[PDB]
């Protein structure tokens, strides 16, 4: 492409800027001497001048030839070249008519005040909706003072004075504890803190304030002192400071407008403002999308940080399944916990029936099996179990403190007495179900009903949201279907896996042999299977 087009592209995307690049004499001579050639006589005038300027006496004579002081040359070294913009002018739109209104968020979280005073203070928010005609303002000007009504505002001030005297030491201690080094935007502490500075609650978005510029950062922006404990920040990015630096200088008195107030703990710059008097809205092209935050050590969950700051959610992989086109859930968490204690009770009852000597002499109502049971050591896992194969194992220390053996004893003593007489009658007795199984089935049923109600509500929720134009899924989470990428894909077609080349369908490892071996050993014969059906089908055929 063309040079102009290329420079345009760079300015737009990369951020190129032709800075001054103040050089030494030895270097200036190097930059203005290598353009001709090597060991060749210097014919250019600037090259000869740079060669002569390598001597200190030559420079101290040339500075006196033009009549400049010793500091004048050093000041002229750091001079901005190129075209300088015209001095900006301040064109005020019209009369500025304002009114002191207390902040809407004045009482901080955790500070209780009298209700009637807060009511009389908040009463002023209703009066802000009235309109004022700006043109006729001059006509109604009254120079006589002592007639203005500011009781509400005064009341706010009264409350404020109390709150600062109450919480100044606490705020300073928190600033010293959480913030280590001072930076433009943090709380003024130590020698920089003078009594009488407006604290952070005083301010509120929408207030015009006058201040002076005290800091200028290339990447962050300008910092204006508004006479408060926290400085103000005007977002100006890196590339705009090529033209904005001619209009904004350190120590300039400026008029700003507060547009947002944030928490100083999470956000680096609590007060962000815009310029009113030096209006430079035509030179800002790069802007911040989200306000800067602190990634501290206390916050360990990124979701809490995202919800506190207000940014988008962490993106995840896009699932191909639909929330409506999927089966329900019919597995209750208490199923395992009840099944294990039920099996434990059955086994203990069987062991007591087998050896009545141990069961005799002790009351069946209360049986102290083990007095060393610990809730912390209830979960014990040992992978040394290799009776049949090398595999891990777990041990569960069931407590007899909550085992309901009262009804279980009666149930077993009623069931065995009937099964024995059924066996004596020439019949085989198969117990259909027990009470614990009925309770587990009831738990499964209520959980299934909960899931059914959830999906019945979801079927109506999807409809209405679709109708009224509302997001069905949380925006910002499933936005990338496969933008996250380059993962090895098992699938051959992605080329992340092999495909036949010259008929190379051969597969490394993936031995089906090991599997074949366990199948072959038990049932080597390659006979044709006759009966083939699922276990549920087998139960259905058995019950039929």
């Amino acid at each position: 492409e063309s040079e102009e087009e290329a420079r345009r592209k760079n300015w737009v995307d990369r951020g190129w800027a032709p800075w001054e690049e103040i050089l030494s004499p030895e270097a200036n001579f190097a930059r203005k001497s290598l353009n001709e050639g090597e060991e060749v006589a210097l014919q250019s005038p600037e090259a000869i001048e740079a060669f002569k300027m390598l001597s200190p006496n030559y420079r101290k004579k040339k500075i006196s030839d033009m009549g400049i002081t010793e500091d004048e040359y050093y000041a002229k070294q750091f001079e901005i070249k190129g075209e300088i913009p015209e001095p900006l002018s301040t064109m005020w739109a019209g009369p500025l008519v304002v009114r002191h209104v207390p902040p809407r968020d004045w009482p901080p979280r955790g500070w209780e005040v009298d209700k009637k005073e807060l009511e009389f203070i908040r009463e002023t928010h209703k009066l802000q909706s009235v309109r004022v005609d700006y043109d006729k303002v001059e006509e109604m000007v009254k120079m006589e003072t002592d007639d203005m009504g500011l009781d509400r505002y005064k009341m706010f001030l009264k409350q404020y004075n109390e709150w600062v005297a109450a919480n100044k030491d606490r705020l300073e201690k928190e600033s010293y504890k959480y913030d280590q080094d001072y930076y433009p935007g943090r709380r003024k502490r130590g020698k920089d803190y003078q009594d009488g500075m407006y604290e952070l609650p005083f301010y509120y978005p929408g207030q015009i304030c006058a201040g002076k510029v005290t800091a200028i950062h290339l990447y962050q922006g300008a910092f204006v002192d508004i006479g408060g404990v926290h400085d103000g920040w005007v977002p100006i990015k890196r590339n705009d400071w090529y033209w904005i630096r001619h209009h904004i200088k350190v120590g300039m008195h400026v008029i700003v407008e507060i547009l947002a107030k944030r928490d100083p703990y999470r956000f680096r710059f609590p007060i962000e403002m815009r310029f009113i008097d030096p209006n430079i809205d035509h030179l800002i092209f790069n802007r911040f999308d989200f306000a800067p935050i602190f990634h501290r050590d206390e916050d360990t969950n990124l979701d809490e940080l995202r919800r506190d700051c207000g940014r988008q959610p962490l993106p995840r992989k896009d699932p191909g399944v639909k929330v409506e086109e999927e089966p329900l859930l019919s597995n209750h968490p208490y199923v395992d916990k009840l099944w294990q204690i039920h099996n434990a009770e059955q086994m203990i009852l069987d062991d007591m029936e087998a050896n009545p000597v141990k069961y005799k002499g002790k009351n069946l109502t209360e049986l102290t099996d083990d007095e060393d049971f610990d809730e912390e050591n209830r979960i014990e896992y040992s992978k040394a179990y290799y009776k049949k194969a090398l595999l891990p194992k777990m041990i569960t220390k069931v407590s007899v403190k909550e085992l309901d053996l009262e009804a279980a004893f009666a149930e077993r003593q009623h069931h065995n007495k009937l099964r024995m007489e059924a066996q004596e009658r020439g019949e085989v007795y198969k117990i259909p179900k027990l009470r614990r199984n009925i309770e587990m089935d009831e738990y499964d049923f209520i959980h299934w009903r909960r899931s059914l109600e959830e999906r019945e509500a979801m079927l109506r929720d999807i409809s209405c949201r679709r109708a009224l134009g509302l997001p069905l899924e949380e925006p910002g989470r499933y936005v990338d279907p496969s933008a996250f990428g380059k993962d090895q894909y098992d699938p051959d077609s992605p080329l992340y896996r092999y495909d036949y080349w010259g008929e190379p369908k051969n597969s490394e490892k993936s031995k089906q042999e090991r599997m074949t071996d366990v199948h072959n050993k038990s049932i080597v014969g390659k006979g044709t299977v006759w009966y083939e059906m699922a276990y549920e089908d087998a139960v259905k055929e058995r019950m039929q």
Binding site: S493, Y498, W501
Partner: protein, 147 residues
């Protein structure tokens, strides 16, 4: 002895730009080169002829033409351009060397020459043709293996 992998030797050419030939060494000792003339002229030296139709070789591997032109970087020159016994059987060190020289993240368990390997090889060769690349030295001990 040398280790399996890609080396990207820049053979000096008498006419035109220097021909960049990349040799892929296998575990057994096979050699498969890829040449670059003044034009794209992406050909292989596996066949007896000078031009082995690297495009037809990549198409016969089983990859779709659209995915082939979409995966490789700089698809303009790719669109303008119009064995399994020992070559594909790369060793354990060959996969590591190919993942180190190139930018692939294929797991170490895979020891077969995937079509993505040839795609990335052609991409790096056509990039080196434009000046984005670095040659390799076969005398370096990192390129040699000790039995």
């Amino acid at each position: 002895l040398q280790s399996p992998g890609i080396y990207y030797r820049s053979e000096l050419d008498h006419n035109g730009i220097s021909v960049y030939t990349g040799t892929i060494i296998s575990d057994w000792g096979g050699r498969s080169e890829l040449e670059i003339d003044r034009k794209a002229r992406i050909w292989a030296r596996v066949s007896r002829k000078q031009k082995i139709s690297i495009l037809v070789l990549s198409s016969a591997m089983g990859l779709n033409l659209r995915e082939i032109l979409e995966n490789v970087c700089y698809p303009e020159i790719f669109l303008s351009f119009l064995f399994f016994q020992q070559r594909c059987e790369l060793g354990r060190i060959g996969r590591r060397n190919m993942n180190r020289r190139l930018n692939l993240d294929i797991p170490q368990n895979n020891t077969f020459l995937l079509p993505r390997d040839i795609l990335a090889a052609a991409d790096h060769l056509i990039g080196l043709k434009f000046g984005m690349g670095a040659l390799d030295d076969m005398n370096h001990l990192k390129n040699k293996r000790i039995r």
